[PDB]
């Protein structure tokens, strides 16, 4: 649903009306209409601090560096502590963050095999030929003059060598 011309668009895609802009109340989930820079400080309650811009958890400021891991990611023990990662990066068992493109890629980028633990292979059965559109069909359906794959990959000339 596209927001009407009379509605403001939050950064996350949410529609709010134009009267509700920099009026001080945290309307948008990300506080787009009240960007806490010149308008209002929208992110959660006043005496209340977030677990980061990527964690919607709200912990009271008394939980900031209070000696316990109040946040899910340990971001409460930041500055006075350590450890933070990225949404597009994968956290290994040792704590290293590698790019998600390296998860289940067949190489131990995590230095302990964590990115290779519980990886259902992107391929399909050994008795199977994978269509280039990722469809799994058994081998005996290749070069059968019938395009059982969605993109005629089972009948592709390159695979058949015809």
């Amino acid at each position: 649903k596209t927001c009407a011309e009379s509605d403001f668009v939050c950064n996350n895609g949410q529609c709010v009306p134009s009267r509700w802009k920099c009026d001080g109340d945290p309307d948008c989930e990300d506080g787009s209409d009240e960007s806490p820079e010149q308008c209002h400080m929208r992110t959660c309650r006043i005496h209340e601090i977030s677990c980061g811009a990527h964690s919607t958890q709200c912990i009271p400021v008394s939980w900031r560096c209070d000696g316990e891991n109040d946040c899910d990611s340990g971001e409460d023990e930041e500055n006075c502590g350590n450890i933070t990662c990225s949404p597009d990066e994968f956290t290994c068992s040792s704590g290293r963050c590698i790019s998600r493109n390296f998860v289940c890629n067949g190489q131990d980028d995590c230095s302990d095999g964590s990115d290779e633990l519980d990886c259902a292979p992107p391929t399909c059965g050994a008795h199977e030929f994978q269509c280039s559109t990722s469809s799994c069909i058994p081998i005996s359906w290749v070069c059968d003059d019938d395009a059982d794959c969605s993109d005629q990959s089972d009948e592709s000339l390159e695979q058949c060598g015809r």
Binding site: C136, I137, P138, S140, D148
Partner: protein
């Protein structure tokens, strides 16, 4: 092997001739694409495939 549930059959035309002269439509519900070994459990009717 795919698990097949709620399987029914209908006949479009029949003609008891020497050649293969009856066409059968079979409807079902499944989870994955695969191969099934199809059989008829009588000698009154012989399947082709």
């Amino acid at each position: 092997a795919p698990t097949i549930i709620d399987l029914t059959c209908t006949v479009a035309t029949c003609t008891h001739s020497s050649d293969f002269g009856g066409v059968l439509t079979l409807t079902y519900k499944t989870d994955k694409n695969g191969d099934c070994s199809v059989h008829s459990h009588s000698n009154v009717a012989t399947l082709q495939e």
